[PDB]
Amino acid sequence: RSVARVYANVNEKLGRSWWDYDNLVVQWGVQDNYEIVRKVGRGKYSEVFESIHLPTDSKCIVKVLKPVKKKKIKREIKILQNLAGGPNVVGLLDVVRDSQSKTPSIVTEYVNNTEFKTLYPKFSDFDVRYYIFELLKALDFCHSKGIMHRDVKPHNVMIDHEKRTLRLIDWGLAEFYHPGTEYNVRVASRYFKGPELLVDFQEYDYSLDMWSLGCMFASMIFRKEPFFHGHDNADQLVKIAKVLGTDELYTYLERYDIDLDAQFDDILGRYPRKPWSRFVSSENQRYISSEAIDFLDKLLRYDHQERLTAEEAKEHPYFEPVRQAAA
């Protein structure tokens, strides 16, 4: 009941060799070439440690996957393998596992990150333009290769501000895009979930990541994290409606023939479109420009087919200072 505007054809054109991650044979590395040092992060499905690849004595990242459906492990590995050498995608170094328990780990390149709540407010307007544009290179790449990231949130973007370098990480929710496939809507982080997830519209595509990038981008330029701050997946849709308005929400549901949950209507009610200008203040004015708002406004749409493609987004006037500086 939806197909993507772009890249709908990719997985058909690349082999079954490219998306059939169920039939992947995993060449496990050697567990004991890696020694864990320092625990640096935590997810619901993973341990992340700073570690050493002992033979090279190299700092790397080991991510210990909570034993979970083997199918899912097979998917993340094949995706990482596929995307290899792509711009600003985290480098996959190894896959290992325990001899006895068979608990797998992914070994990835280390990135000297700064936590975003500290790093983002140190940003200039050029900085935001530059790093979003480098994030747009990763989304455009992986989308061009039939893959939706599906967890694009600042926690999964690692920025080394001294090297001026960027990596997208946590491809644990990523999928291959197949035209017409119904996908699980329980993806993303509540704050970065697109409306299509919140109304249980299952036939979504790469445009999910663009909404997500929009929320992240609104955090940065408006200095509100999160920009939409829902207490649960129901309230999340309400916080979105208080900004984009409900008039546009009902034309969107009507256009895609979504019927809402019955008790959604005790809580939603009627909201006029709050304009983007009403979010400007003295403390966030540094990031604000007529180009930024226009760009943000073409990511944050109810209808996933009115959103920019990562490629169209790269052409936007907002990124002209970074394109120019490139040369």
Ligand SMILES: Nc1ncnc2c1ncn2[C@@H]1O[C@H](COP(=O)(O)OP(=O)(O)NP(=O)(O)O)[C@@H](O)[C@H]1O
């Ligand atoms: N390559 C890396 N370099 C540095 N830190 C990293 C790297 N990969 C992951 N981390 C840290 O580990 C945290 C969790 O890693 P992540 O890959 O997001 O695992 P997860 O279990 O999928 N968690 P979640 O994002 O909630 O789904 C990240 O937020 C980073 O702070």
